[PDB]
Amino acid sequence: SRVEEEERLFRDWDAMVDNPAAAAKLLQELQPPVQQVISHCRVNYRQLVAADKPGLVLDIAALSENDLAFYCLDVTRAGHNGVLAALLLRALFNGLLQEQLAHQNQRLPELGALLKQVNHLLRQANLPGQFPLLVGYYHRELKNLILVSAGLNATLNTGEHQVQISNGVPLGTLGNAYLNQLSQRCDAWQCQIWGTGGRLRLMLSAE
Amino acid sequence: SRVEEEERLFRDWDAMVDNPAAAAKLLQELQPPVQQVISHCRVNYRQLVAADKPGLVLDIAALSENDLAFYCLDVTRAGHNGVLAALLLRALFNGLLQEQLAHQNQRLPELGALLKQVNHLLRQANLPGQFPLLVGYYHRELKNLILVSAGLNATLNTGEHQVQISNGVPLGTLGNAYLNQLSQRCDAWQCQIWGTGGRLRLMLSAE
């Protein structure tokens, strides 16, 4: 179905660019389930206010049997272009990170470099605006969590460790390098992400 | 004088182990100046309450012409052993990090590995207790700041980015790996560190 969702995102893209209602409706239908198992990890997601319109959106998916990645985007800053950016990320984000790891001999993710690539992708898709974005990577065996924020606020709790991040440089500008990085080793974590568009909660545990 | 201070720390160590008043008096005299230039960086330090007794102590020094490192230790958790640990770190911390970089082909610091080494050093110096410690690295040309906390709270402000960290695992236990890491690229930053023992402020700018 994720494979099938990728085909509808590719085939219907032009129709979604010209129909904001349809694009927003599909974006709401593509939200993660409340709980799932990804790469031997329990993953729980919920918006902290029950709403019908997309504000802060999230996607999370496996990169291999043993690691996963996620992105979180505030679509309200760029309006329709923000919704389209979320749909574009849903189609290509995981594949872009998988390609970068395929060129890294030890599969050590460079989320800052990925954000630079996403910035270029948004330009080449003709999606101007500002896109507050948070990207994360987790490996179930190494127990390593990596977080990079570009314009979003976030709290990370691992029990022994607590971090609050508030980055003010969203994606969408020409020459910003996004190099803040939080790396944390943990077996479980709870993360809350928020911006103007809303606030969500994402938690992870071993299966 | 820093070279000369290293010789008195080595020669008088045994006398300081047996005289807590002398050890604490020397520790207070070894605090950083209010402002200095280290590795082409302005460095400003102040305790946020004017006090005579050591609580949260800091040292910062160059690793080369272009980078520097610092540590911050709450000496009140282990009492006299905490004061001694600070004196031991003042003597050896910079040299230990310089040796680690000499074995890394690109001089990429591993502050988590350094903390593991410091934990072993405290054991071999026969200094039991708990030692809340924060270590930092900054490179003036790459503009990269790295922070790792083991039991201390800290806020980092770079203008575009703000981070609050509160780690609960101080040094002194047997088998803790210390792997939280904040990496941030910035030209200037202001950092406030605190624990039970007190609170200090450290800021950096280009010279």
Other beta carbons less than 10 A from residue A172's beta carbon: 23
Q: Which residues of A touch B153 (CB under 8 A)?
A: none
* CA separation for the pair B91, B85 (Å, rounded): 10
CB A41 within 8 A of CB A68: yes
Residues in a beta bridge with A74: A56
- Given A144, A160, A167, which is nearest B169 (Cβ)? A160
Looking up tokens 């679509």, which residue turns up?
Answer: A75
DSSP letter, residue A196: T
Structure resolution in Å?
2.0
Closest-CA distance of chain B to residue A152, Å? 10
Single-letter amino acid code for the residue at B50: A
CB atoms near residue A206 (< 10 Å): 10
Distance from C-alpha of B108 to C-alpha of B97, rounded to nearest angstrom? 11
- For residue A49, give the CATH number of its domain: 3.60.40.10
User: Residue B32 has what DSSP assignment?
Assistant: P
Would the CB atoms of A182 and B182 count as touching at under 8 Å? Answer: yes
* Chain A residue with minimum CA distance to B142: A179
* Contact status of B182 with chain A (Cβ, < 8 Å): yes
Q: Which of B163, B173, B184, B192 to mutate to test the interface with A (most CBs of A within 10 A)?
A: B163
Cβ atoms of A44 and A203 closer than 8 Å: yes
Q: Do B161 and A184 touch (CB under 8 A)?
A: no
| Number of domains forming the structure of chain A | 1
Q: At what angle do helices A111-124 and A80-103 cross, to 10 degrees?
A: 130
Distance CA A205, CA B54 (A): 41
CA distance A18 to chain B (A): 35
For chain B, helix (H) and strand (E) counts, in that order, are: 5, 11
**What's the residue count for chain A?**
207
CB nearest to A163's CB, from B165, B168, B185: B165
CB hemisphere CA count around B180 (13 angstroms): 28
Q: Which H or E run contains B59? A: strand B56-62
Query: Could you tell me which of B42, B43, B68, B45 has the C-alpha nearest to residue B56?
Result: B45
Distance of alpha carbon B22 from alpha carbon A206, whole angstroms: 51
C-beta atoms surrounding B140 within 10 Å: 20
Q: For chain A, say whether B179 makes contact (Cβ under 8 Å).
A: yes
Strand partners, B149: B134
Helix (H, G, I), strand (E, B) or coil at A2: helix
Spatial CA neighbour of A172 closest among A123, A114, A111, A117: A123
Is B173 an 8 Å CB contact of chain A? no
Q: Which of B197, B122, B97, B205 is nearest to B153 (CA)?
A: B197
- Put simply, the chain B residues between 40 and 69 with a CB less than 8 A from any chain A CB are none
Task: Determine the structural domain holding residue A174 and report its residue range.
Answer: 2-206
Which chain A residue's Cα is nearest to B180?
A: A184
Query: CA-to-CA distance for A87 and A79, rounded, in angstroms?
Result: 13
Q: Is B177 on the interface with A (CB under 8 A)?
A: yes
Sheet holding B56-62, edge to edge: A56-62, A67-74, A133-139, A144-150, A181-185, B181-185, B144-150, B133-139, B67-74, B56-62
Nearest one of A151, A154, A157 to A184, comparing CA atoms: A157
